[PDB]
Write an enzyme that holds these catalytic residues in place. Structure first.
Site, PDB file in Angstrom:
ATOM      1  N   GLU A 183       0.788  -1.220   0.000  1.00  0.00           N
ATOM      2  CA  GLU A 183       0.000   0.000   0.000  1.00  0.00           C
ATOM      3  C   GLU A 183       0.824   1.277   0.000  1.00  0.00           C
ATOM      4  O   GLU A 183       0.587   2.217  -0.757  1.00  0.00           O
ATOM      5  CB  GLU A 183      -0.834   0.021   1.287  1.00  0.00           C
ATOM      6  CG  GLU A 183      -2.252   0.506   1.004  1.00  0.00           C
ATOM      7  CD  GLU A 183      -3.198  -0.662   1.243  1.00  0.00           C
ATOM      8  OE1 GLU A 183      -3.399  -0.926   2.456  1.00  0.00           O
ATOM      9  OE2 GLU A 183      -3.677  -1.300   0.295  1.00  0.00           O
ATOM     10  N   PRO A 211       8.706  -9.191  -2.252  1.00  0.00           N
ATOM     11  CA  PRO A 211       8.274 -10.572  -2.432  1.00  0.00           C
ATOM     12  C   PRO A 211       6.873 -10.628  -3.016  1.00  0.00           C
ATOM     13  O   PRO A 211       6.595 -11.486  -3.856  1.00  0.00           O
ATOM     14  CB  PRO A 211       8.363 -11.199  -1.048  1.00  0.00           C
ATOM     15  CG  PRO A 211       8.243 -10.045  -0.110  1.00  0.00           C
ATOM     16  CD  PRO A 211       8.781  -8.829  -0.818  1.00  0.00           C
ATOM     17  N   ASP A 212       5.986  -9.736  -2.599  1.00  0.00           N
ATOM     18  CA  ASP A 212       4.623  -9.679  -3.099  1.00  0.00           C
ATOM     19  C   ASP A 212       4.255  -8.245  -3.486  1.00  0.00           C
ATOM     20  O   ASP A 212       4.805  -7.302  -2.918  1.00  0.00           O
ATOM     21  CB  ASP A 212       3.599 -10.174  -2.063  1.00  0.00           C
ATOM     22  CG  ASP A 212       3.659 -11.681  -1.898  1.00  0.00           C
ATOM     23  OD1 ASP A 212       3.488 -12.395  -2.915  1.00  0.00           O
ATOM     24  OD2 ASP A 212       3.981 -12.160  -0.790  1.00  0.00           O
ATOM     25  N   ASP A 265       7.147   6.680   7.185  1.00  0.00           N
ATOM     26  CA  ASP A 265       6.557   6.887   8.491  1.00  0.00           C
ATOM     27  C   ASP A 265       7.552   6.815   9.631  1.00  0.00           C
ATOM     28  O   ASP A 265       7.122   6.579  10.768  1.00  0.00           O
ATOM     29  CB  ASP A 265       5.410   5.884   8.689  1.00  0.00           C
ATOM     30  CG  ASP A 265       4.279   6.080   7.689  1.00  0.00           C
ATOM     31  OD1 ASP A 265       3.699   7.192   7.648  1.00  0.00           O
ATOM     32  OD2 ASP A 265       3.967   5.139   6.921  1.00  0.00           O
TER      33      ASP A 265
END
Ligand SMILES: NC(=O)c1ccc[n+]([C@@H]2O[C@H](COP(=O)([O-])OP(=O)(O)OC[C@H]3O[C@@H](n4cnc5c(N)ncnc54)[C@H](O)[C@@H]3O)[C@@H](O)[C@H]2O)c1
Ligand SMILES: NC(=O)c1ccc[n+]([C@@H]2O[C@H](COP(=O)([O-])OP(=O)(O)OC[C@H]3O[C@@H](n4cnc5c(N)ncnc54)[C@H](O)[C@@H]3O)[C@@H](O)[C@H]2O)c1
Lengths: 273, 262
Positions: free
Chosen positions: B23, B44-45, B130
């Site tokens: 995200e 990885p994804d 963040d």
């Protein structure tokens, strides 16, 4: 065509190298000083405002100086809040001024604004060769020797900064957009962000207390966002937090996380202080 | 409190490393993709929108076979958790202009920041999403005004919510205004400038020429510059210049807009 990546650098305590202390140098100083950066200025002569505005410790050239290196001046009482030059080297740039005595330190940004173009290009290329292509460099007014561009700026009351950049348009257009934006907030007058800050805080808390917590709770985010977007920057300082909390309670529970607020005109008349 | 330094980076063809394709990574792709940067994404994804929007060629390493800066696409995708060896660049005169992480593991994010700062020096730009203390810079609220003007709003110890609210207010200002036709304004401001130079070419009137153009363009504003009648403003410049000893006193704004616009 390609867009710029606009970024807000956190320069507190970062070492910055500015070469050339004239008219362009001074304008670089106006933007660098309020950042808390720790700057080294290299220039044989200085524009008249620099010493009094940003380096009262620098001595005039005609005062006798018996140090082994009389060209170098270190601000003896420097800190990020001073808005003062950290180090001034009275001289044309020399390669050895790239050295930081301490080799963990590094220059975050290296800038030039001197009248010699071939020497500026040489400095650019020496800096990229020594510190790698990751080293940020800006050669004033020479777009091919710049990793980034300064643009038109404006401040909306001490905590908000706006940068206006053009992608292949004269800088002129940036200044016109800036004045337009400045006129807009000038006409708007007080936004009273202090109080807007508080109320968004108690709005957030209040909704977290009524929350029903992990999992719709993004709804809390999307609810606070849509609500505050409907008030806008002009009215967030004037929200009646309790009335909005009562409206959330109803939209959250008993409405199935409705996200469909009342029309803006009504929200402003029924839910402002 | 210190102010930030807001800058506009030219990334056309610069290598950029992004670690984490979720995200937050997707939000970094939105800002980096229109910049012409040549990005390597390590993850990885992938969030399901990335391939469709930015890496169709993806269908361990995937090189985009038809990459160019105008594509708005990832150059290289490495389907793996970050490994130190992905910092290496074939030619080592090459470098990563910006290195960014957007992964959920904090210690690994911090390890990556320090490794990058150790290997590439403290001059290396790094942003760990963040984590303020591991960021050299912050993204902020942005808007485009056409395909030529870019605006960045940054807050200084204020929620980013305010940046967005100020941004939506500026967006609305320019939405009310309507087409600015800046391509035409560019052309007219050029022919205006050329014209004035002819009516006052001597080296001694340089400054006058500038301030006349500036005050004039200030008065039309960004909204009306595309609509100026160059010939007519040239006739106005002539009179203000010769006759009125280089006068900078212009027709009042609403007359200037009525008479000197086409
Ligand atoms: C921009 O940047 C350039 C500077 O413009 P400006 O309006 O400020 O001019 P300016 O003459 O007002 O400023 C030039 C400054 O650079 C300094 N300088 C000259 N040679 C230098 C060198 N080799 N190393 C370090 N400092 C040196 C001069 O002392 C002076 O302070 C312009 O030519 C344009 O390209
Ligand atoms: P946020 O909201 O984006 O969280 P998120 O879960 O939405 O995204 C985290 C992303 O980082 C990736 N990731 C996790 N650990 C990683 C590592 N060590 N190296 C590279 N990618 C890694 C995951 O595959 C995922 O794509």
């Amino acid at each position: 065509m390609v867009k710029s990546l606009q970024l807000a650098h956190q320069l507190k305590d970062k070492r910055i190298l500015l070469i050339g202390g004239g008219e362009v140098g001074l304008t670089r100083l106006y933007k660098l000083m309020p950042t808390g950066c720790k700057l080294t200025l290299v220039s044989p002569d200085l524009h008249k405002s620099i010493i009094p505005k940003f380096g009262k410790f620098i001595q005039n050239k005609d005062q006798p100086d018996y140090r082994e290196d009389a060209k170098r001046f270190i601000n003896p009482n420097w800190d990020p809040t001073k808005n003062e030059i950290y180090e001034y080297i009275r001289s044309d740039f020399k390669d050895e001024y790239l050295d930081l005595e301490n080799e963990n330190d590094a220059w975050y940004i290296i800038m030039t604004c001197i009248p010699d173009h071939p020497e500026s290009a040489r400095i650019y290329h020496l800096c990229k060769e020594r510190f790698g292509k990751q080293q940020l460099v800006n050669v004033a007014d020479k777009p091919d020797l710049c990793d980034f561009y300064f643009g038109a700026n404006l401040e909306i009351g001490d905590r908000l900064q706006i940068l206006i950049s053009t992608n292949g348009l004269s800088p002129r257009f940036g200044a016109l957009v800036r004045d337009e934006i400045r006129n807009l907030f000038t006409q708007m007058g007080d936004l009273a962000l202090e109080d807007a800050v508080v109320k968004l805080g108690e709005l957030r808390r209040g909704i977290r207390l009524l929350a029903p917590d992990d999992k719709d709770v993004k709804y809390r985010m999307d609810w606070a966002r849509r609500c505050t977007d409907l008030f806008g920057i002009q009215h967030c300082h004037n929200i009646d937090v309790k009335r909005l909390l009562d409206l959330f309670k109803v939209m959250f529970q008993e409405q199935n996380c409705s996200l469909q607020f009342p029309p803006r005109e009504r929200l402003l008349s029924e839910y402002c202080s």
